[PDB]
Amino acid sequence: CQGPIEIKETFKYINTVVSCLVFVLGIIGNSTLLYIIYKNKCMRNGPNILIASLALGDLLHIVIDIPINVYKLLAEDWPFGAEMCKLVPFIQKASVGITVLSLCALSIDRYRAVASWSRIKGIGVPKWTAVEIVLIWVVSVVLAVPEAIGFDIITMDYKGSYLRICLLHPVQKTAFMQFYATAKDWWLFSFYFCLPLAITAFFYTLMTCEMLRKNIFEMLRIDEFNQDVDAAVRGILRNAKLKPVYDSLDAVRRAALINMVFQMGETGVAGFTNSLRMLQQKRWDEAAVNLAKSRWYNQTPNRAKRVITTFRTGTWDAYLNDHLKQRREVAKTVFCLVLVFALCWLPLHLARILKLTLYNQNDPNRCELLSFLLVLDYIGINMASLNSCANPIALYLVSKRFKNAFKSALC
Numbered sequence: 001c002q003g004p005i006e007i008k009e010t011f012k013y014i015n016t017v018v019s020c021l022v023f024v025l026g027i028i029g030n031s032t033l034l035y036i037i038y039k040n041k042c043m044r045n046g047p048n049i050l051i052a053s054l055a056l057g058d059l060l061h062i063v064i065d066i067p068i069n070v071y072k073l074l075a076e077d078w079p080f081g082a083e084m085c086k087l088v089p090f091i092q093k094a095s096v097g098i099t100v101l102s103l104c105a106l107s108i109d110r111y112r113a114v115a116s117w118s119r120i121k122g123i124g125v126p127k128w129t130a131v132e133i134v135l136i137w138v139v140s141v142v143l144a145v146p147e148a149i150g151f152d153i154i155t156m157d158y159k160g161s162y163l164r165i166c167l168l169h170p171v172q173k174t175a176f177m178q179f180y181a182t183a184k185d186w187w188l189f190s191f192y193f194c195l196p197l198a199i200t201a202f203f204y205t206l207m208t209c210e211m212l213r214k215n216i217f218e219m220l221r222i223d224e225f226n227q228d229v230d231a232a233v234r235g236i237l238r239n240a241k242l243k244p245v246y247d248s249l250d251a252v253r254r255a256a257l258i259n260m261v262f263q264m265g266e267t268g269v270a271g272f273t274n275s276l277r278m279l280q281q282k283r284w285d286e287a288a289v290n291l292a293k294s295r296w297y298n299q300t301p302n303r304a305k306r307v308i309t310t311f312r313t314g315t316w317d318a319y320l321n322d323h324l325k326q327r328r329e330v331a332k333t334v335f336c337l338v339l340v341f342a343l344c345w346l347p348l349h350l351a352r353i354l355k356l357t358l359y360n361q362n363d364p365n366r367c368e369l370l371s372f373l374l375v376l377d378y379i380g381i382n383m384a385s386l387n388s389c390a391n392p393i394a395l396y397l398v399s400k401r402f403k404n405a406f407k408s409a410l411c
């Protein structure tokens, strides 16, 4: 049909608006972030230098994506020359590669060592951050060479005036590129989206599950033996009155229950049948006022208030220390950065795998199908561009340390 033409022409209004917003917000946000990391000495040494690298991949994504490619939506003929069309997707593919790979090395270095007092997990090597930044950019350049080598320009003579263009050549010289030509939509999706997100989520989960276990060791060392904490869990499951309420509680409340078990034993905790039933029914304020009425509070008021506060609040506010602040800070920064990425490259990566799997020219239901696919793909482009500019903002909102470091540059 001739319907989706109006969609493309109308969307030209959206892309020019987004790209210009993305450009201004992108250059300012990453520059601020970049100046912040190098002004601070602890972050210059700390693994947050990887975030300074990510700010470079984002900032470089901005200055290749917005200037060159937005120029090609306005100008119908490709006007930069032959070398440039090998260079631009090279630059853009390597740039995205930097952003994903900076995320991965960040979470791996965070799991290797949570903070300065931590012990590196395996194969400690001095000044790893410098070594890791070098490896990230090289691999990002490598993954983008297939774009650069195969990108030549083709001349077409259109229905109106003639116009030359540039895309990835279908006719290719090496069997290397002939393979890459067809399987690029997967390569772009199976790598840039899957491997970075699979690797980063895996270490983030390993790290957060380790943080929790150490916070339990931390809270028990505060109120008063790693095998003792696991034997308590093993013994809680064996006790019949504690297993059901235990399985219902979340890891935070399970810890306070574990804390209660370390004082009185299983037999002693099993007596709060009124309070245990209230915890199962999620009536937190009730049991908190009800646990205050216990003799347990009178024997040790200070410690009980914290355990009661932990049951009431569900967060370690009563157990806040140096570690628990740091563990929460790192985990929130890593989590927020991956979530920003995933939500911005899913719409685009999902556009591609949906177009390759089920698309055929024979049917006439295309113009309802095609209209749906081109629209969602154009948004995915604006999503991916938004990621390049929404990373520096994301750190301010969910990182107390970054929100203050920006405020230090403010004043």
Ligand SMILES: COc1ccccc1Oc1c(NS(=O)(=O)c2ccc(C(C)(C)C)cc2)nc(-c2ncccn2)nc1OCCO
Pocket: 065, 069, 072, 085, 088, 089, 093, 096, 166, 167, 188, 189, 192, 348, 349, 352, 381, 382, 384, 385
């Ligand atoms: C990270 O790599 C990608 C993985 C999956 C999808 C896209 C990817 O990178 C891309 C991507 N890769 S691509 O399809 O192979 C490509 C590269 C280069 C060109 C030019 C303009 C001819 C030089 C066309 C198409 N193309 C575009 C995109 N932009 C404008 C319009 C048409 N296409 N946006 C992406 O995302 C970033 C958004 O600013």
